[PDB]
Amino acid sequence: AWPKVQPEVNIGVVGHVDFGKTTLVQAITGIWTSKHSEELKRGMTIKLGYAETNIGVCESCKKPEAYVTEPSCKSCGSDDEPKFLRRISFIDAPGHEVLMATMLSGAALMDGAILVVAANEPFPQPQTREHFVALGIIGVKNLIIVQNKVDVVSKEEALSQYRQIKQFTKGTWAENVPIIPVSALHKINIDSLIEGIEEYIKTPYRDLSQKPVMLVIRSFDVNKPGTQFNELKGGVIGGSIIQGLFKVDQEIKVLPGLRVEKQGKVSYEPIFTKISSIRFGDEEFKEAKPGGLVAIGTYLDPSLTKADNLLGSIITLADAEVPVLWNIRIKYNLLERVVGAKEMLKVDPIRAKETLMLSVGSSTTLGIVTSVKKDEIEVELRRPVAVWSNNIRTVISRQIAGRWRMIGWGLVEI
């Protein structure tokens, strides 16, 4: 039989709106990531979606057909059980420009990524570029480019686009990134994509000597309505472990924590709690490691976790020393152009007193520029940000024409 383990690697699925990301994830895993009513109604990804699958290989069969997502080699004639390779999971990003920030949060959780371009659309589009550049900046460079919807066009049209993609990636970090043509909707050439995932998105080395840190993107509760108000199950916090590992019954804290109001005034206090359960999808475990999206059950009052209240938080061991900053210094670099914009546009230099948006881990925060130099800015934050390490990248956005657009990036200096 195949073992029941947690996913050991996270793969982002990103790209311009409507190019078929969620359908691609479904073609691979059998799962439709959209769980919210607004998503189903509007036919769009809004919150980060998630899906897992085992990956295995039929050792006596021919590739790529030998790659399977279930323990059966029948499809290639063998009666032998396929060799289990690993369990993987997908972080399904929204393509809509207005949801760029969400993509950025998701990118903090990715070990690698798939960029979806549509074969029946002109390359390249605004969020094709924006997501590409974001991936580069954040360091998600184990990339596969998927040419989706090939069922819609002839082979020569798809090839013409392929040439365009090669031209675009040339002279960049992605020059040798593979391009794999599929039909997500009708499930064509999906096995070449599995093969490509095994070849180009290896499970990263996980440094065990690192303190446990989890980035939070979800929070909620498994409390069915009508449940007795003093028999309620504790709050659940969802996210991804980016370093170290967590274990059931560990004492943890949520940083910055909860918003405290004294009269008018607003401060933040760390939320201390204990891990009551660890869950990956539908399976329970005794420990949680990087790779996958984990649901950490706690003893917290459900009202503290309801409706993704803790999005952007981090979780650490109770006694970890973690700076929670209302002011930050960033060693920065601006893009030449606002890549996410429909019309070509130059990036204006940072100006004192202007409001910027900062993506740090899974958090998104507005701040006012208090100092500008050539290589560094200092920012006064509207809400504090937990900074768990010395080498954390931030992505910098500016509001242009009422739209938050990525304009640069930097290192948060402590």
Confirm or reject binding of residue 69 to Na ion (CB under 5 A): yes
Please answer whether residues 395 and 104 qualify as being in contact, where contact means their C-beta atoms are separated by less than 8 angstroms. yes
Residue nearest to Mg ion (CB): 45
Rg, the chain, Cα only: 22
Confirm or reject binding of residue 371 to Na ion (CB under 5 A): no
Residue 199 vs residues 64, 78, 163: alpha-carbon distances, Å: 11, 23, 22
178/194 Cα distance (integer angstroms): 13
Window contacting ligand GCP (CB under 6 A); options: 105-113, 147-155, 301-309, 357-365? 147-155
49/105 Cα distance (integer angstroms): 12
Closest distance of CB 31 from Na ion, Å? 8
Confirm or reject binding of residue 45 to Mg ion (CB under 5 A): yes
Please give the backbone phi and psi of residue 208, each rounded to the nearest 5 degrees, phi first. -75, -20
Nearer to ligand GCP, 3 or 43 (CB): 43
Confirm or reject binding of residue 96 to ligand GCP (CB under 6 A): yes
Nearer to Mg ion, 21 or 253 (CB): 21
Window contacting ligand GCP (CB under 6 A); options: 60-68, 143-151, 271-279, 401-409? 143-151
Residue 161 vs residues 54, 170, 342: alpha-carbon distances, Å: 32, 14, 20
Closest distance of CB 282 from Na ion, Å? 13
Number of residues that bind ligand GCP (CB under 6 A): 19
- Binders of ligand GCP among residues 169 to 198 (CB under 6 A) are 183-185
Which partner from the list Na ion, ligand GCP, Mg ion, none does 364 bind, CB cut-off 5 to 8 Å by kind?
none
Please answer whether residues 130 and 339 qualify as being in contact, where contact means their C-beta atoms are separated by less than 8 angstroms. yes
Nearer to Mg ion, 13 or 396 (CB): 13
Alpha-carbon torsion, ordered 137, 204, 296, 361, to 10 deg:
-10
Closest distance of CB 9 from Na ion, Å? 15
The residue from 10, 12, 14, 22 that contacts ligand GCP (CB under 6 A) is 22
CB-side neighbour CA atoms (13 Å) of 105: 27
Confirm or reject binding of residue 12 to ligand GCP (CB under 6 A): no
Sheet containing 143-148: give its strands across: 67-68, 49-57, 83-92, 10-14, 112-118, 143-148, 179-181
Look at residues 220, 218, 226 and name the one whose alpha carbon lies nearest to residue 302: 220
Closest distance of CB 306 from Mg ion, Å? 25
Confirm or reject binding of residue 22 to Mg ion (CB under 5 A): yes
Closest distance of CB 211 from Mg ion, Å? 34
Nearer to ligand GCP, 189 or 276 (CB): 189
Q: What binding mask, one character per residue, do residues 321-340 give for Na ion by CB under 5 A, x or -?
A: -----xx-------------
Please answer whether residues 275 and 250 qualify as being in contact, where contact means their C-beta atoms are separated by less than 8 angstroms. yes
Alpha-carbon torsion, ordered 69, 71, 72, 76, to 10 deg:
50
Confirm or reject binding of residue 102 to ligand GCP (CB under 6 A): no
Q: 349 is written with which tokens? A: 């230099």
Q: What binding mask, one character per residue, do residues 34-73 give for ligand GCP by CB under 6 A, x or -?
A: ----------xx----------------------------
The residue from 14, 20, 21, 330 that contacts Mg ion (CB under 5 A) is 21
Residue nearest to ligand GCP (CB): 95
> What does 164-175 look like in DSSP terms, one character per residue?
HHHHHHTTSTTT
Nearer to ligand GCP, 163 or 186 (CB): 186
Segments in 247-400 forming alpha helices (H) = 302-305
What DSSP element (H or E) covers 195? Answer: helix 190-200
Number of residues that bind Na ion (CB under 5 A): 4
Confirm or reject binding of residue 218 to Mg ion (CB under 5 A): no
| Other Cβ atoms closer than 10 A to 261 | 8
Residues that bind Mg ion (CB under 5 A): 21-22, 45
